[PDB]
Enzyme design. Structure first.
Site, mmCIF file in Angstrom:
data_model
loop_
_atom_site.group_PDB
_atom_site.id
_atom_site.type_symbol
_atom_site.label_atom_id
_atom_site.label_comp_id
_atom_site.label_asym_id
_atom_site.label_seq_id
_atom_site.Cartn_x
_atom_site.Cartn_y
_atom_site.Cartn_z
ATOM 1 N N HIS A 3 50.954 6.858 72.919
ATOM 2 C CA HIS A 3 49.822 6.222 72.200
ATOM 3 C C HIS A 3 49.379 6.973 70.935
ATOM 4 C CE1 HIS A 3 48.653 3.255 75.484
ATOM 5 N NE2 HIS A 3 49.448 4.075 76.131
ATOM 6 N N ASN A 49 44.953 -0.667 79.276
ATOM 7 C CA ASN A 49 45.923 -1.297 78.343
ATOM 8 C C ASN A 49 45.541 -2.779 78.219
ATOM 9 O OD1 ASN A 49 47.592 0.813 77.608
ATOM 10 N ND2 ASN A 49 49.179 0.304 79.076
ATOM 11 N N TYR A 56 45.892 13.715 81.849
ATOM 12 C CA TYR A 56 45.145 13.541 80.596
ATOM 13 C C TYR A 56 44.394 14.823 80.194
ATOM 14 C CZ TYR A 56 46.214 8.565 80.511
ATOM 15 O OH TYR A 56 46.874 7.361 80.525
#
Ligand code: HEM
Ligand code: HEM
Ligand SMILES: Oc1ccccc1Cl
Ligand SMILES: Oc1ccccc1Cl
Ligand SMILES: Oc1ccccc1Cl
Ligand SMILES: Oc1ccccc1Cl
Ligand SMILES: [Cl-]
Ligand SMILES: [Cl-]
Ligand SMILES: [Cl-]
Ligand SMILES: [Cl-]
Ligand SMILES: [Cl-]
Ligand SMILES: [Cl-]
Ligand code: NA
Ligand code: NA
Lengths: 480, 480, 480, 480
Positions: free
Chosen positions: B52, B125, B335
């Protein structure tokens, strides 16, 4: 047949399923393979190059045709037939990794020569001049050209404000807004050292030198409409093209030419021969052939070899020295500086960056020391005859200084417009039309005052140039 | 009117010329302004997101329409009319930072809610399912989709090899190779939490929840040929479109819906409700409206705010918890792990990432400590009543475990093909044709064996689906 | 005879003088050797270990005396006479690099075994228990022990506040405040795995195991006054002693013993056998000899090998697995996590950390990629039979879970005081006096309330222990 | 009363237990508090300073007694009574962070003045001269002094090999091996700018200047045996003493004196006034009082403020400039260069390093951008009158250059022994005895040839000096 392993060398029993509380339950912390594999994935990326982030690399050979020992003691140029391995990266300039290769931009043309006397980097662009003549302005120039720091989109109004107020840029723009602003690919492309360098021979005599690379494939460019059409279908056509040529055995090549100028010619020219906004006349300083570079091997791994490649204009070898060019002077510092950050303090140990010549010195440690150092002696002078010593045979020249004082002061004879005019007049009518068309599409939306200043700068270069641009932009300049 | 200064706060006498030996001589080391300015320029870049990397951000407000306190204690959802500030980043997935927004890819849809009980990140998403159901496979999937590590070009033969041998991917591909694989822009676009989460109310009762964002602007997609047409002329059209909407006051918005499911329905289904390759029926589990998110403010600085933004599915708030979904479980780790490397150990202090709720804890130090820490006490338990203490009111639930062993084992009822077939049959004929057309362009050049396995997977989803794809690829499947 | 060179491999003409404007003028920016040399010097340092920063390392050999195949399938233990290379680092804990080796602290005892099935790290200390039993407390404990964050001086009032409010620490403190709190050096020193681990044999049968290292040189300790005497004259005596032993051929050695316990013994003990604040009786679970580790080689380079050494308790090998010990569970994460930051994403490629067993997997890239990667396939599953595959022969065991819920809850049977009493009573009178003397010197200046709570904790361990301490501190404990 | 929170601002329900499979089972990955808290702990440490790693800091005030405007336009020195805030760090040099403050070394004496025209760093040591006079030798010197790269112990044979072969060191050693080699603490200690600097007044007239700090507490030193006795009991006595003075209100102070020399005196001397191995006569260039510095405030957080403090000799303010001293010249580069690596590209934003004067420039981005940037214009020249501009009122001087060539060549009149002899003779008989005693303990084990060369160097300083040393070492030097 091989086992998949962890980085500890333990074979992996299951590379499909995480370790969980039963077949559907939450995941356990005791899953070394999962954590190790995710943690490394999570750390794959390193910072892209601050400029020329988009690019492609290949290896090859350089072979001397004409020895240059009359003019430079450089080992790699000493003998007819002498072959030196190279690594080469080509690139765009402004936009990030991933950006299209169909955009207007200089293209990078960076060659690393793996010589017997050390690595020599010639860190060139396709176009033979530059926008600015002092490194202090580089971040300004780059910032103006880069995507706007609010919108993330490149804005002509920003870079035209900087360029118009930096009229030394006028010659460069007169090249970049020809169709050579968008080379068709990296193979059908010019190369240029840009700067004047100093070549020093075995007698210690110095001449000024410029480098040119001439593609065996010829130069081919894209119109704005041809670029758009390719952009539709492939954002990476130049990277594809280079790889594919090489893979099919269609190796691209460039002949290397130099121009040579006596230092004494400074004082008689109407420009500074170390102003990188200037070229030297090919009539007055003819191209002399040196040899040929053929690219014939794609890298095994793009990240390890092309992405981690580090070039610096300060990677000079005996017989080849910097000039006083103030743009060049800043580059000497900025490349290894940025590379230490981008790649690590030990970037010079990354295989692509390593010299073929031996490396022995007293430096040590740093992040990711992988070289198995040994020994007690990491300081010089020392009492040990076998430890590495300086070698005065390899001293550099001692260039004469003409200044009295430490100063911040522009060069004399800046002469910002003359060569830009000469270049304009050298264009065919077709090329002149393309120039004007390309300039007009760029300037038409830019602030009026900036627009007028741009016209005025190109008018000072050549009155026809300036007037044609003004007509095409619909700007009446009669009152001035 | 202001001075240009160094970072030491000294006004700069000359921001044009380097300090040299006379007006044309080489440059001096004693030029603090030059070195400082070049050194900082040299360090501007940080690593891009491992996926991304290309994206755009904006701020706005989320407002509750229907309070959800019956099902979740989440503070931000507690009252009709309650407004919570948000930051949102949208993105593509695979290609790097400068890459076109006209490529096929899921789009990221990451929302950071600045709640009174902490920051809540719903890292979504557009498409509502995923290719895989376990985080251990994520680096494989990504590596297969990313540009080939030799060529730097994405290769269908690589990702198709992976996807075909990973048949749980069949449902996702059936969505991605519709024209929704290329949203027209980020505004006219669906949003999905993808995972099942757990919502926990004040009585400690738990339900499974799924999130859906419905665009006020409607869903619009691009055909392959419409995408190419845009790409010809703009490689950042979605980023442009988002900014420009907001700049002109045409604020895009999305309504938030949930579906809610009793944990006890697990046995009532022929698929695992926490398998993120699955959706839940909207007939059986109807969409329930929660409120509306409006984006109304562009950032002031793209790098500081959008590029440095950090979201994690593990940024959960009391009343909103992870499910046992194994894909999600790995994301909880990955993350913040990647962010510590990408942004620094103190990335939670970067303004966009800072909570509105108070932060007090015993963590300390780390690169770039900018927060003025004070006090002697950095450990708990301690004897001081005024120092921060745990608060058992804020305990999370205690989910029941159905396994009795630590295992690596796929979920029961993977059911890889059924919902894919349902989705295929739900398409109009036009959409079915687009699907087949898009799949055929992608698959026509891949390894024949891999090509056949793809066909077989889509055949198992639906025999018409499969046969149509085989016909279009010219693959005779009669013998099977 | 060797040339001193730059990192580019160019011989250095003058390693004494900077390049200047005449013999006494300011320095020039065009001095690549100077800038490269200073820039690498400027980047020598990396972060020290967050704990155990002071330490020393050595290589040697481990040789099996009694094969352990009855209890573990671990390859390195499979037969009599089998030799495995080791690297070992010893350390203190709390104070930074450079700090004296005469301070009170546990000592680290980290052993890396380069086995044919991967690297196995047994990350031990000298003392056989620990202060806490859950990893969530580790930063608190460390922060309390570390120098005060305002004064940079360690403060008993801080760590005694934490320890007293953390009464599970009572056993550990009863060891650490004997004179074994200051080992005489690293050779005359105990070693302990501390945690219970799981050993798994080829039939999949599991036992709990504990590890013990017994010095061939015997255990010797320093009184407070003997420590002070050494500290006066050498702040690195242990590092010196180790190196010098090995340099003289006087190789220190340790015999490895284990204790083995059936999993079923859990339920009949009055403590949790996976509580790392507990030891196991040597009468009930006798020491069983395994083999002998001899250290016989100093490293060639301290930074490259000892400073960059990375050990983790999660570096386990087939047949040797974690227990459910909640302290251990956190360590499995924290070591490779801290290492990625301390050393880089690719720290496992630093020579000392490399396995002897082959490594093949699909990870890539990361800062300082030096390994010359190649090939197009970096994803699994894939269609290529010669690419690395999982090997189910190497699955780990599937430990039984006794809990039915995700909880945050202390273990049953914490039994914080009993073994502390047993240890006190096992001391000679001399040792008891030393204990009380060492405790009294540490406690005499701490807050009265904290001082009382400490007394109370040691009173609960043993009433004589507690009363003697109270007397020596001049604290009247009659009212309790 | 406050909640303990995560960095997301969510209150922490349990800061004692990890999340586990029942009260005694293994740990779950879904424990954001645990992973966040460990992960930050794991990243606390940053690289220590490559030299002067051990140190202590304090804030205070500098107050002008005699305005210096006749000699320098420096704003902070312009008026009687003018007060400027300072931050000061003191330090040892060679050994790491945790190392004893009782060792022989120069002491660092670094003062940051927060002036209205920018931050001025005067980065001094206690001793007024240095070992070497060219920065190219600094890494060599340091490597020789630092612990041996194999053994991690400092070795006199190493640094004496370097020093003996670097006879310009002879003056420095003659100071450092007096008992002033071990100051009693940081308060009872001299301070020195060491280098000659250039002071420039509002007329552009330049003088050479030297700085001296005289302690209100007087100078006190430790014998070797007094140092050992302190070392026994406290390895951080100077850090303790500084903090405690200030905590008690017993503020240490130093009076600032300068010496001033006309540039034209160069020829009047038998040494180079910019050779930092030299002092200037206090008879010929008398000390002139400027003002007083008082340290009166301990930092709130040792890491954030003292450890992250960044000083540079190149942090000069208008009216105060570098000299041509080649040692100093290298320093101008090496401090900010090392700091970028040690602290981050944006280290100038760390509060302690921030100027009080406004900062406005076109630099941007970099790791950990926390300053909320805004605006579209990050480039100059630009068309906007309100954007920051250069200010030619703040130009630096233009020092005259006497060389006509870029050279690498030692200064004229190195005069390596004379002042060393003068300093020897200035010592009392007691001090001379301490000198010889200290030297003898250092030299007695070093290589005989090196030992003899040391004796010879000190003999050249003064024949008595040399003979006494030879006698004490038992070296017969009759016959030279
Ligand atoms: C002051 C002027 C300039 C400065 C300050 C400057 C700075 C830089 C920097 C910092 C990089 C990133 C290097 C890295 O990450 O490895 C770079 C890359 C590059 N620059 Fe420049 N540059 C300047 C002028 C030029 C000129 C005149 C040329 C050609 C004549 C040029 C060609 C290149 C090329 C080809 C690369 C890419 C090298 C590669 O492919 O790895 N630049 N520049
Ligand atoms: C195991 C599966 C997955 C893993 C390991 C994974 C891992 C990651 C990582 C490491 C990043 C970059 C984060 C950063 O640099 O800050 C990322 C970004 C992202 N992922 Fe995933 N991901 C997975 C699945 C998914 C799923 C299922 C979704 C949506 C449901 C998703 C949506 C995103 C988004 C939107 C971003 C970009 C956030 C932003 O705009 O800054 N990913 N992922
Ligand atoms: O330097 C560039 C590059 C692209 C477009 C315009 C300019 Cl001036
Ligand atoms: O995941 C993707 C993304 C783009 C194109 C094809 C696939 Cl499978
Ligand atoms: O083996 C195959 C391939 C394609 C479609 C159906 C089958 Cl059974
Ligand atoms: O050559 C030497 C050596 C040592 C002392 C004195 C002299 Cl002159
Ligand atoms: Cl060196
Ligand atoms: Cl990290
Ligand atoms: Cl905390
Ligand atoms: Cl892998
Ligand atoms: Cl750096
Ligand atoms: Cl600037
Ligand atoms: Na309601
Ligand atoms: Na046996």
């Amino acid at each position: 047949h091989k086992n998949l392993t962890t980085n500890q060398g333990v074979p992996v029993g299951d590379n499909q399923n995480s370790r969980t509380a039963g077949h559907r339950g939450p995941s356990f912390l005791d899953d070394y393979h999962l954590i190790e594999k995710l943690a490394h994935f999570d750390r794959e990326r390193i910072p892209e190059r601050v400029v020329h982030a988009r690019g492609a690399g290949a290896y090859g050979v350089f072979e001397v045709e004409n020895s240059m020992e009359k003019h430079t003691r450089a080992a790699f140029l000493s003998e007819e037939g002498k072959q030196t391995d190279v690594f080469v990266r080509f690139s765009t300039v402004i936009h990030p990794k991933g950006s299209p290769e169909t955009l207007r931009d200089p293209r990078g043309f960076a060659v690393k020569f793996y010589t017997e006397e050390g690595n020599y980097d010639l860190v060139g662009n396709n176009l033979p001049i530059f926008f600015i003549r002092d490194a202090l302005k580089f971040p300004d120039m780059v910032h103006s050209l880069k995507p706007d720091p609010v919108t993330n989109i490149q804005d002509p109004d920003r870079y035209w404000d900087f360029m118009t107020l930096t009229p030394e840029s006028t010659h460069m723009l007169t090249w970049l807004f020809s169709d050579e602003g968008i080379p068709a690919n990296y193979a059908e492309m010019r190369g240029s050292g840009v700067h004047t360098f100093r070549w020093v021979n075995k007698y210690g005599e110095t001449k000024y030198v410029k480098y040119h690379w001439r593609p065996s494939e010829g130069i081919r460019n894209l119109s704005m409409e041809e670029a758009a059409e390719i952009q539709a279908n492939d954002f990476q056509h130049a990277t594809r093209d280079l790889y594919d040529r090489i893979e099919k055995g269609n190796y691209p090549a460039w002949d290397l030419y130099v121009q040579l100028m006596p230092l004494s010619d400074y004082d008689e020219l109407d420009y500074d021969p170390c102003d990188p906004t200037k070229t030297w006349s090919e009539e007055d300083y003819p191209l002399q052939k040196v040899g040929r570079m053929t690219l014939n091997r794609n890298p095994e791994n793009f990240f390890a070899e092309t992405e981690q490649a580090a070039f610096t204009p300060s990677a000079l070898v005996p017989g080849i020295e910097a000039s006083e060019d103030k743009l060049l002077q800043g580059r000497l510092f900025s490349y290894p500086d940025t590379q230490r950050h981008r790649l690590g303090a030990n970037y010079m140990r990354i295989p692509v960056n390593c010299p073929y010549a031996p490396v022995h010195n007293n430096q040590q440690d740093g992040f990711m020391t992988t070289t198995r150092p040994s020994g007690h002696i990491n300081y010089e002078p020392n009492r040990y005859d076998d430890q590495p010593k300086e070698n005065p045979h390899y001293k550099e020249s001692e260039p004469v200084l003409h200044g009295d004082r430490m100063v911040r002061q522009k060069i004399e004879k800046p002469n910002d417009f003359k060569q830009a005019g000469e270049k304009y007049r050298s264009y065919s009518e077709e090329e002149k039309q393309a120039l004007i068309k390309n300039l007009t599409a760029d300037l038409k939306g830019v602030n009026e005052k900036t627009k007028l200043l741009a016209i005025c700068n190109f008018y000072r270069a050549d009155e026809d140039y300036g007037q044609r641009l003004a007509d095409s932009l619909g700007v009446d300049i009669r009152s001035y």
